[PDB]
Amino acid sequence: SAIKPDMKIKLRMEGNVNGHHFVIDGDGTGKPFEGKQSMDLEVKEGGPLPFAFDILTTAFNRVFAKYPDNIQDYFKQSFPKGYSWERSLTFEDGGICNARNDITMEGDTFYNKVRFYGTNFPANGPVMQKKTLKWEPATEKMYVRDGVLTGDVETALLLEGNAHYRCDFRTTYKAKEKGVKLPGAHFVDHCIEILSHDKDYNKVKLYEHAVAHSGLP
Known part of the structure; x- marks a missing residue:
């Protein structure tokens, strides 16, 4: 495979939430086959961030x-050319975010060009008042809609x-190479945790564990 058991992660995020511009760099490592990654994020511009x-x-x-052998792994088969995703995030108080990532690979490293745009968050809401503690563990339902x-x-x-x-979100995933074969419907369980951070989240250590399954225990 193109994908090694230990991969480095380089990331730049540029974005805008409720008119606040920011640039965040990421350096990390992960184990693609174990579904584990950790990364050091550093706010480069716009800090300290005025939102959660x-x-x-x-x-x-x-x-x-x-990914088990019995589910097509669209993501690992997208390399070395890579893939991109687009996501819309809808929060219960009317907050709405659009994010995208273009993922490429050069040797042992995934490069990530990430854009995040958020709007319509109430000034008095938990996001703009920094009242959030964490994401609860969540299951992503994977299926093909119109190709x-x-x-x-x-x-x-x-x-x-x-x-x-x-929060509800929908992600669409597209391989750069035509004829990467689409998978069957399946689930991915996600756990995401901020392992440590400094005063105003200018430095954040982030961990994610993800496992694909077909539903049954």
């Missing part, structure tokens, strides 16, 4: 997912004061 760092973390690559691999998630962020803040 948590809304960005799912934008910071489904190559880092343990496009689509991933749906219905999840929530835990807030301070024993409350949840609901």
Whole structure:
């Protein structure tokens, strides 16, 4: 395979949430076949961020997912040329985000060109008031809609004061090479955690564990 058991991650995110511009660099490593990745993020411009760092973390690559032999792994078969995704995130108080990633590979390293745009977050809401604690574990439903691999998630962020803040998102995934064969419908379980950070989330260590399954235990 093109994909080694230990891969480096280089990432630049540029974006805008509620008119606040930012640039965030990422350096990390991961184990594509174990579905594990960890990365050091550093805010380069626009810090300290005036919104909950948590809304960005799912934008910071489904190559880092343990796929069983019985499910087509679209993501690992997309290399070395790579793939891109587009995502729309809808929050229960009317917040709406569009994110995309163009993923390429050069030797042992995945390069990530990430864009994140967020709007319509209420000034008094948990995102702009920085009241989020974490994403709850979530299952991504993978299926093909009209020739496009689509991933749906219905999840929530835990807030301070024993409350949840609901988020739905839809991702579309496209291989750069035509004739990478689409998979059957399946699930990917995701856990994402901020392992450490400094005062205003200018430096963040982020971890994700993901596993593909066909539903049954």
